[PDB]
Structures are given as structure tokens and as C-alpha cells.
PDB file of C-alpha atoms in Angstrom:
ATOM      1  CA  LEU A   1     -18.118 -18.781  24.215  1.00 49.85           C
ATOM      2  CA  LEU A   2     -14.663 -20.746  23.655  1.00 51.59           C
ATOM      3  CA  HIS A   3     -12.786 -21.164  27.308  1.00 51.49           C
ATOM      4  CA  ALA A   4      -9.718 -23.139  25.631  1.00 51.00           C
ATOM      5  CA  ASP A   5      -6.526 -21.131  26.728  1.00 52.80           C
ATOM      6  CA  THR A   6      -5.524 -20.954  23.328  1.00 53.98           C
ATOM      7  CA  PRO A   7      -1.826 -19.520  21.772  1.00 56.68           C
ATOM      8  CA  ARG A   8      -1.793 -16.647  19.715  1.00 61.49           C
ATOM      9  CA  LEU A   9       0.234 -18.212  16.764  1.00 62.37           C
ATOM     10  CA  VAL A  10      -1.152 -15.885  13.761  1.00 60.21           C
ATOM     11  CA  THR A  11       0.802 -11.975  14.371  1.00 59.06           C
ATOM     12  CA  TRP A  12       1.427  -9.550  11.593  1.00 58.79           C
ATOM     13  CA  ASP A  13       4.376  -6.640  11.820  1.00 55.69           C
ATOM     14  CA  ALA A  14       4.066  -3.853   9.557  1.00 56.98           C
ATOM     15  CA  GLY A  15       6.871  -2.450  10.198  1.00 59.56           C
ATOM     16  CA  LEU A  16      10.609  -3.066   9.737  1.00 63.74           C
ATOM     17  CA  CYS A  17      11.761  -6.747   9.512  1.00 66.72           C
ATOM     18  CA  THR A  18      15.191  -5.886  11.306  1.00 65.78           C
ATOM     19  CA  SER A  19      16.425  -6.561  15.320  1.00 66.92           C
ATOM     20  CA  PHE A  20      19.470  -4.385  15.054  1.00 67.73           C
ATOM     21  CA  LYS A  21      20.045  -0.712  15.098  1.00 68.26           C
ATOM     22  CA  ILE A  22      22.565   2.029  14.836  1.00 66.54           C
ATOM     23  CA  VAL A  23      23.058   4.627  17.016  1.00 63.30           C
ATOM     24  CA  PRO A  24      25.398   7.649  17.417  1.00 64.80           C
ATOM     25  CA  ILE A  25      28.100   7.186  20.483  1.00 61.84           C
ATOM     26  CA  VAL A  26      29.437  10.640  19.692  1.00 62.45           C
ATOM     27  CA  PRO A  27      27.584  13.615  17.576  1.00 63.50           C
ATOM     28  CA  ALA A  28      29.277  16.028  15.496  1.00 64.23           C
ATOM     29  CA  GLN A  29      28.788  18.359  13.103  1.00 64.84           C
ATOM     30  CA  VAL A  30      30.917  19.121   9.858  1.00 64.70           C
ATOM     31  CA  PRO A  31      30.747  22.114   7.278  1.00 65.41           C
ATOM     32  CA  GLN A  32      29.842  20.602   3.445  1.00 66.68           C
ATOM     33  CA  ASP A  33      30.304  22.057   0.156  1.00 62.54           C
ATOM     34  CA  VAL A  34      26.495  20.807  -0.908  1.00 59.45           C
ATOM     35  CA  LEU A  35      23.201  21.639   1.479  1.00 59.16           C
ATOM     36  CA  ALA A  36      20.442  20.654  -0.162  1.00 59.54           C
ATOM     37  CA  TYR A  37      18.660  19.210  -3.466  1.00 61.75           C
ATOM     38  CA  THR A  38      16.281  21.802  -5.246  1.00 62.70           C
ATOM     39  CA  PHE A  39      14.321  21.768  -8.194  1.00 62.20           C
ATOM     40  CA  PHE A  40      12.737  24.662  -9.789  1.00 63.82           C
ATOM     41  CA  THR A  41      11.654  27.299  -6.720  1.00 63.98           C
ATOM     42  CA  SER A  42      11.460  23.387  -4.691  1.00 62.70           C
ATOM     43  CA  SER A  43      14.179  22.731  -2.122  1.00 63.86           C
ATOM     44  CA  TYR A  44      14.326  19.244  -0.788  1.00 63.65           C
ATOM     45  CA  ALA A  45      16.877  18.889   2.454  1.00 63.77           C
ATOM     46  CA  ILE A  46      19.539  15.446   2.581  1.00 62.94           C
ATOM     47  CA  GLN A  47      18.160  12.755   4.925  1.00 60.78           C
ATOM     48  CA  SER A  48      21.810  10.127   5.267  1.00 62.82           C
ATOM     49  CA  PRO A  49      20.556   6.475   5.856  1.00 63.17           C
TER      50      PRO A  49
ATOM     51  CA  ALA B   1      -5.784  -4.283  -7.118  1.00 62.61           C
ATOM     52  CA  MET B   2      -3.633  -5.824  -4.447  1.00 63.27           C
ATOM     53  CA  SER B   3      -1.261  -8.464  -4.910  1.00 61.66           C
ATOM     54  CA  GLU B   4      -1.541 -11.671  -2.673  1.00 65.49           C
ATOM     55  CA  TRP B   5       2.147 -11.264  -1.707  1.00 67.50           C
ATOM     56  CA  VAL B   6       5.429  -9.618  -2.630  1.00 70.65           C
ATOM     57  CA  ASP B   7       8.913  -9.442  -2.129  1.00 70.32           C
ATOM     58  CA  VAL B   8      10.888  -5.985  -1.447  1.00 68.22           C
ATOM     59  CA  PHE B   9      14.320  -5.426  -0.582  1.00 64.11           C
ATOM     60  CA  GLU B  10      14.832  -3.121   2.353  1.00 67.82           C
ATOM     61  CA  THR B  11      16.622  -2.162   5.526  1.00 66.85           C
ATOM     62  CA  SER B  12      16.599  -5.293   7.796  1.00 63.35           C
ATOM     63  CA  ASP B  13      18.374  -8.131   8.999  1.00 65.89           C
ATOM     64  CA  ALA B  14      18.895 -11.616   7.852  1.00 67.30           C
ATOM     65  CA  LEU B  15      19.036 -13.028  10.716  1.00 68.71           C
ATOM     66  CA  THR B  16      15.306 -11.993  12.018  1.00 71.59           C
ATOM     67  CA  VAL B  17      14.730 -12.691   8.604  1.00 70.11           C
ATOM     68  CA  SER B  18      15.566 -16.031   8.209  1.00 71.23           C
ATOM     69  CA  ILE B  19      13.637 -16.632  11.466  1.00 74.59           C
ATOM     70  CA  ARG B  20      10.215 -15.498  10.375  1.00 77.08           C
ATOM     71  CA  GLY B  21      11.164 -17.574   7.725  1.00 77.33           C
ATOM     72  CA  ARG B  22      10.484 -20.813   9.369  1.00 76.67           C
ATOM     73  CA  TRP B  23       8.114 -19.262  11.684  1.00 77.60           C
ATOM     74  CA  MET B  24       6.299 -18.973   8.455  1.00 79.63           C
ATOM     75  CA  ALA B  25       7.150 -22.946   7.134  1.00 79.22           C
ATOM     76  CA  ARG B  26       6.103 -24.189  10.754  1.00 80.09           C
ATOM     77  CA  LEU B  27       2.604 -22.674  10.129  1.00 81.67           C
ATOM     78  CA  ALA B  28       2.021 -23.001   6.798  1.00 79.65           C
ATOM     79  CA  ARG B  29       2.532 -26.925   7.464  1.00 81.56           C
ATOM     80  CA  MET B  30      -0.342 -26.938   9.957  1.00 81.75           C
ATOM     81  CA  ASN B  31      -2.750 -26.439   7.315  1.00 82.11           C
ATOM     82  CA  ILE B  32      -5.909 -27.794   6.329  1.00 80.31           C
ATOM     83  CA  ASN B  33      -9.264 -26.563   4.009  1.00 82.64           C
ATOM     84  CA  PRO B  34     -12.635 -26.708   5.020  1.00 79.94           C
ATOM     85  CA  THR B  35     -13.464 -30.051   2.600  1.00 77.73           C
ATOM     86  CA  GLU B  36     -11.447 -31.626   5.324  1.00 76.68           C
ATOM     87  CA  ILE B  37     -13.231 -30.266   8.330  1.00 74.54           C
ATOM     88  CA  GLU B  38     -16.398 -31.284   6.871  1.00 71.61           C
ATOM     89  CA  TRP B  39     -15.122 -35.346   6.868  1.00 70.21           C
ATOM     90  CA  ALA B  40     -14.005 -34.949  10.205  1.00 71.60           C
ATOM     91  CA  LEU B  41     -16.716 -33.268  11.979  1.00 71.19           C
ATOM     92  CA  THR B  42     -18.862 -35.700  10.199  1.00 69.95           C
ATOM     93  CA  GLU B  43     -17.353 -38.997  11.022  1.00 70.09           C
ATOM     94  CA  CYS B  44     -17.552 -37.886  14.404  1.00 69.26           C
ATOM     95  CA  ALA B  45     -20.894 -37.801  14.578  1.00 71.35           C
ATOM     96  CA  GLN B  46     -21.042 -41.193  14.033  1.00 69.10           C
ATOM     97  CA  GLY B  47     -23.703 -40.959  11.059  1.00 66.86           C
ATOM     98  CA  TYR B  48     -26.392 -38.915  13.099  1.00 68.92           C
ATOM     99  CA  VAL B  49     -25.995 -35.289  11.119  1.00 69.57           C
TER     100      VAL B  49
ATOM    101  CA  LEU C   1     -28.276  53.660 -31.446  1.00 66.48           C
ATOM    102  CA  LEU C   2     -27.873  50.328 -33.432  1.00 64.86           C
ATOM    103  CA  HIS C   3     -32.072  48.587 -33.504  1.00 62.92           C
ATOM    104  CA  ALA C   4     -32.088  45.772 -36.002  1.00 60.62           C
ATOM    105  CA  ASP C   5     -32.510  42.746 -34.243  1.00 62.63           C
ATOM    106  CA  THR C   6     -29.108  41.598 -35.184  1.00 62.73           C
ATOM    107  CA  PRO C   7     -28.252  37.844 -34.308  1.00 64.51           C
ATOM    108  CA  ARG C   8     -25.023  37.010 -32.058  1.00 64.97           C
ATOM    109  CA  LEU C   9     -22.981  35.186 -34.954  1.00 67.83           C
ATOM    110  CA  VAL C  10     -19.360  34.947 -32.978  1.00 65.55           C
ATOM    111  CA  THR C  11     -18.882  33.205 -29.877  1.00 64.19           C
ATOM    112  CA  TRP C  12     -15.970  31.788 -28.081  1.00 63.71           C
ATOM    113  CA  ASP C  13     -15.546  28.752 -25.779  1.00 63.95           C
ATOM    114  CA  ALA C  14     -12.620  28.001 -23.984  1.00 61.91           C
ATOM    115  CA  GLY C  15     -13.918  25.175 -22.239  1.00 61.75           C
ATOM    116  CA  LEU C  16     -13.532  21.860 -23.385  1.00 66.88           C
ATOM    117  CA  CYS C  17     -14.755  20.869 -27.180  1.00 68.05           C
ATOM    118  CA  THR C  18     -17.328  17.513 -26.353  1.00 64.06           C
ATOM    119  CA  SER C  19     -20.733  17.362 -25.702  1.00 65.05           C
ATOM    120  CA  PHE C  20     -20.300  13.512 -23.899  1.00 64.10           C
ATOM    121  CA  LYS C  21     -19.515  12.863 -20.459  1.00 65.32           C
ATOM    122  CA  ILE C  22     -18.681   9.732 -18.689  1.00 62.47           C
ATOM    123  CA  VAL C  23     -20.635   9.185 -15.334  1.00 61.16           C
ATOM    124  CA  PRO C  24     -20.438   6.445 -12.553  1.00 60.24           C
ATOM    125  CA  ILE C  25     -23.236   4.618 -11.891  1.00 59.30           C
ATOM    126  CA  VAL C  26     -22.693   2.200  -9.643  1.00 56.15           C
ATOM    127  CA  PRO C  27     -19.328   2.987  -7.132  1.00 55.69           C
ATOM    128  CA  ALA C  28     -16.668   0.783  -5.490  1.00 55.71           C
ATOM    129  CA  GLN C  29     -13.563   1.098  -3.840  1.00 57.36           C
ATOM    130  CA  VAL C  30     -10.482  -1.035  -4.306  1.00 61.98           C
ATOM    131  CA  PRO C  31      -7.622  -1.637  -2.265  1.00 62.34           C
ATOM    132  CA  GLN C  32      -4.094  -0.792  -5.053  1.00 61.67           C
ATOM    133  CA  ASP C  33      -0.512  -1.793  -4.496  1.00 64.87           C
ATOM    134  CA  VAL C  34       0.695   2.159  -5.159  1.00 64.26           C
ATOM    135  CA  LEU C  35      -0.671   4.713  -3.489  1.00 60.76           C
ATOM    136  CA  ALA C  36       0.439   7.797  -4.890  1.00 61.38           C
ATOM    137  CA  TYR C  37       3.960   9.151  -6.512  1.00 62.53           C
ATOM    138  CA  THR C  38       6.557  10.432  -4.219  1.00 62.37           C
ATOM    139  CA  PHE C  39       9.498  12.345  -5.309  1.00 62.81           C
ATOM    140  CA  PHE C  40      11.608  13.389  -2.794  1.00 62.13           C
ATOM    141  CA  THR C  41       9.425  14.886  -0.010  1.00 60.92           C
ATOM    142  CA  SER C  42       6.968  15.544  -1.802  1.00 57.50           C
ATOM    143  CA  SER C  43       3.625  13.054  -2.803  1.00 60.39           C
ATOM    144  CA  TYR C  44       1.054  13.850  -5.628  1.00 58.41           C
ATOM    145  CA  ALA C  45      -1.634  11.640  -5.741  1.00 55.46           C
ATOM    146  CA  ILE C  46      -3.150   9.254  -8.474  1.00 52.66           C
ATOM    147  CA  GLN C  47      -5.828  11.072 -10.734  1.00 51.90           C
ATOM    148  CA  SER C  48      -7.677   8.595 -13.242  1.00 50.26           C
ATOM    149  CA  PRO C  49      -8.796   9.825 -16.240  1.00 49.51           C
TER     150      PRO C  49
END
């Protein structure tokens, strides 16, 4: 055994390196001219950042 | 076929990034290589092993 | 009836016109930087020749 009260120095994060997040305070839904992207018979929805 | 490290653009925040940047450095400076361990442990032994 | 012991000259092959095939003798799996192709929300896997 290794009894020493050793500190964990090496640690990893596979996620995003950010500490601030943008949130909605007052929701809303508005009409739009374009509703989605289409490819042949497929159709993908619009995802905003 | 995987790279040992990589630089990528992606959502994140300069502050957090900058911090982990220094944390990186600090650790890296603490590096040792087995050959050094050989010398250390051997010298401690006062020459019996 | 047509009794004659007639030979089959005309025959067809809709497959591949090759007689040699490449096989794996010793398998292996290695890490890669790229894992697949992505299109909008879809994602296709990488198939090697």
C-alpha cells in the first residue's frame, strides 16, 4: 500500500472548455419563411447556436 | 492513426482556457524521466543495490 | 424433344470479374482521429476497400 494522502493533480475533461452558458429569460416563438433544410427526400431541422 | 495532440476551434471561454493553460505548464515543468529515477533510487541505496 | 447431349456455351455472371481475393491473416484495431462522415444530423461510417 501507498498510505500517503496524495493529491490528484492529473485530471481530464472531454467536454467543452467553457464556464459561461447562455440562457433564455423570456421565451418566444416567431413565424419564419424557412422551416428546414431538404435533401432529396430527406429533411433536416434548423438548430441554432 | 490518432495524433498525440491537436488544436481545435470550438465554443469555450478565454478565461477558463487561459487558466487550464497555466495549470498545464505548471505540471509539465514538474516532469521527470525514468532515467532520472534510476539515478535517484540508486544513489539513495548507498551502493548496495 | 431435343435429346442431343448439348453443351452449355452461353452463361452469365452478374457479379465481379475477379478471381483473387484479399484476406486478413492477423487482425488488428487501431485508434483513429476520424471516426465517421457526418451530414447535418446524419452520420455514415467509414468503409475501407
